[PDB]
């Protein structure tokens, strides 16, 4: 990744949800989070709203 | 409390309790001694 | 996509999961960051004997070199050595550190301790005595108030000597017996009776002076018997409550969680439902019942020694579940080592 | 509309709605304006002991870097850290404070802090003691003028010493049996006999002088046991009103409404009708029931613990629905801390 993220702001943007690209060591790089935009109980997940 | 997805771990804390009896027995005498040590003079000591 | 004719194929989507054992001893040591004899690199990795030596190639006298030399002699394996600023940093990086041993350093190593219990690592440490000769006129509490009260460590007093060399502190003289008990039969036993060879305690402490220091906190005594000599004795953590005694109960739970929570990083994200449900039930209770017959956790009809419970209703109600929780909660009663042993004669 | 012929779709118009749990503990510190060994930004964010150890590389004597280690070492999180005269602003601001601690600050701490009660932002403060030694000759009340009378804030006198290096004042050691309360076991239990680790406090009060500081104002004093030691010991507040004592019985109703007003603002300019007093009603007392198992409110038959009402005529009759306001009502009776025991013997 270009900058390398941590799970302390991890817990700020997880929340106003958009979602983030980690790195892990045993497994390398991996997507992580499915949550879309706009936050009322309604859709919040991707395969909810697909 | 819980903002990254990942795995939690948490546990049930109680301070569950019981009773187990000690001894009644063991007194203290208070007549009058001859310590060695000037810090033995007015202090509780155990005696086995 | 069924675009173009011709013979298409799937296969299975999803199949089985199951936890995977343990290591159980990875232990990491106490440097002295004001020592000269050594390195200037914090953070060593050492894994047997061998490199050991050709890093050191001297027989040395300080406390570090005397720690490792003790517990490579008793088996062994991986273990770290890294100094005492740089806890913090060294455990929620390698992800399989068990035990936080002191290698003859008190003041600093107390308080990186707690900092990594209280993010919640799920470590157990162990702590040194009091250097010498309690003398036993009296005081029996305030050498007791210098170490940190909390369900994870003890302490290990008399400060064995190491006949062929110089001292040894009693935290390595507790990790060799660590060592050669797990590989031996299981870590639900407590490090109690199996012996160490080698080393030779500096006193003779008593048969009595074992009492006044059982309540309350858990001294933990290494006293030498007649036939099996030099031995530990006693398996006891900080406190005195009736859910958090007995060193061997408090490891049970600490080594039962950090496989399932190692496991369960691939099952997230997966979609909360009903075949969900009946898949982890049913791959919980079969690690469960592997350790039940092995003599870890005592009961007859292995229904009454643990539970395991998920739902829609028991457990994880309807609004919780559109927030995305999948909450459980299983419990399971283990065994407690037999300390005192009465027994009654009588007429009949 | 309906424009030209072919197939329409429509979807649902409203969805379900729920209240987010909690944060619980986010405290902002006190800072002192004429301190030299510092930076001179007011305002500055730590989020853990990380970036705390690369801005201030060596190890300090004053009382916020004596505070902030007492933080952190006792687990911790997210804390900020303002100027003395900066805080009527950062309290309106960031929308998570919680505690207003106080680190060796008095004189104009506590008009500050009678400020943001003034707009009723729902908070709770606690504060220091006296600097020494009572000496419980006489003068019960002198000693107590000096603190604004509120129900938010304790005292926390005997100013513990930090046998490591210098003294901490008593708030940090107050916030931090918090921190390992509401993680370990809910907000509704005092933190009461959670015990700290590496604090010694400077004197030894009685047994005694306890009492007479009981009745009026909430002194609770900082006393060593044998057995469990440096626990924090008494949990009251200011006042004395049957309806506001118990510190965890002010922190209950304290944050069971920080989060229903946090989750009601996307149902504002929402339609005053029938649906919207059915939906609210079946989900508030949702959230109820999820804090009714939980031992947080006591009683049986849990009609009995809570109610939730919102009408027509029972409420808001039609002259002040057409001025649009929507009033609700709910009651609920929490717990209470058993501060004294008594138990009688007969013969029967």
């Given at each position: 990744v270009s900058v390398r993220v941590t799970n302390e702001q991890q817990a700020?943007?997880?929340?106003?949800?958009?979602?983030?690209?980690?790195?892990?060591?045993?497994?390398?790089?991996?997507?992580?989070?499915?949550?879309?935009?706009?936050?009322?109980?309604?859709?919040?997940?991707?395969?909810?709203?697909? | 409390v819980t903002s990254v997805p990942?795995?939690?771990?948490?546990?049930?804390?109680?301070?569950?309790?019981?009773?187990?009896?000690?001894?009644?027995?063991?007194?203290?005498?208070?007549?009058?001694?001859?310590?060695?040590?000037?810090?033995?003079?007015?202090?509780?000591?155990?005696?086995? | 996509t069924t675009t173009y004719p011709?013979?298409?194929?799937?296969?299975?989507?999803?199949?089985?999961?199951?936890?995977?054992?343990?290591?159980?001893?990875?232990?990491?040591?106490?440097?002295?960051?004001?020592?000269?004899?050594?390195?200037?690199?914090?953070?060593?990795?050492?894994?047997?004997?061998?490199?050991?030596?050709?890093?050191?190639?001297?027989?040395l006298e300080d406390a570090f070199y005397t720690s490792l030399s003790l517990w490579f002699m008793h088996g062994g394996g991986k273990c770290y050595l890294v100094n005492e600023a740089n806890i913090a940093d060294a455990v929620a990086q390698y992800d399989d550190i068990t035990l936080i041993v002191a290698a003859g350093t008190d003041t600093t190593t107390y308080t990186a301790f707690t900092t990594v219990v209280g993010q919640g690592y799920r470590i157990f440490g162990l702590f040194d005595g009091p250097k010498e000769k309690i003398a036993g006129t009296a005081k029996p509490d305030e050498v007791m108030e210098e170490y940190p009260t909390s369900?994870?460590?003890?302490?290990?007093?008399?400060?064995?000597?190491?006949?062929?060399?110089?001292?040894?502190?009693?935290?390595?003289?507790?990790?060799?017996?660590?060592?050669?008990?797990?590989?031996?039969?299981g870590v639900w036993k407590a490090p109690a009776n199996q012996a160490v060879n080698g080393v030779t305690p500096a006193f003779a402490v008593s048969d009595d002076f074992q009492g006044k220091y059982n309540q309350g906190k858990a001294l933990n005594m290494i006293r030498t018997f007649s036939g099996q000599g030099?031995?530990?004795?006693?398996?006891?953590?900080?406190?005195?409550?009736?859910?958090?005694?007995?060193?061997?109960?408090?490891?049970?739970?600490?080594?039962?969680?950090?496989?399932?929570?190692?496991?369960?990083?691939?099952?997230?994200?997966?979609?909360?439902?009903?075949?969900?449900?009946?898949?982890?039930?049913?791959?919980?209770?079969?690690?469960?019942?592997?350790?039940?017959?092995?003599?870890?956790?005592?009961?007859?009809?292995?229904?009454?020694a643990w539970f395991v419970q998920v739902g829609k209703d028991l457990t994880m109600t309807q609004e919780e579940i559109n927030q995305g929780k999948m909450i459980i909660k299983i419990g399971l009663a283990a065994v407690r080592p037999a300390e005192f042993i009465i027994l009654q004669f009588s007429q009949d």
């Open positions: 700020e943007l997880n929340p106003k949800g958009i979602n983030v690209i980690r790195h892990f060591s045993d497994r390398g790089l991996v997507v992580w989070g499915s949550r879309t935009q706009k936050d009322d109980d309604d859709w919040r997940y991707i395969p909810v709203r697909r | 990942g795995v939690y771990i948490e546990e049930d804390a109680s301070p569950a309790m019981s009773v187990s009896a000690s001894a009644t027995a063991v007194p203290l005498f208070v007549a009058r001694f001859t310590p060695l040590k000037p810090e033995l003079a007015g202090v509780i000591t155990r005696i086995g | 011709g013979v298409y194929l799937s296969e299975d989507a999803v199949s089985s999961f199951s936890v995977n054992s343990a290591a159980t001893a990875v232990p990491l040591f106490a440097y002295d960051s004001e020592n000269t004899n050594t390195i200037n690199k914090p953070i060593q990795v050492f894994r047997n004997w061998a490199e050991f030596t050709v890093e050191y190639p001297t027989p369900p994870f460590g003890a302490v290990f007093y008399p400060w064995g000597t190491l006949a062929s060399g110089a001292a040894v502190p009693p935290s390595a003289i507790a990790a060799a017996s660590i060592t050669q008990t797990d590989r031996t039969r030099t031995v530990v004795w006693g398996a006891r953590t900080l406190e005195d409550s009736d859910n958090w005694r007995y060193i061997p109960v408090r490891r049970l739970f600490n080594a039962v969680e950090r496989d399932i929570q190692k496991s369960l990083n691939k099952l997230v994200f997966e979609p909360n439902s009903q075949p969900t449900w009946q898949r982890v039930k049913a791959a919980v209770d079969s690690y469960l019942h592997s350790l039940w017959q092995q003599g870890a956790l005592a009961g007859n009809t292995p229904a009454d």
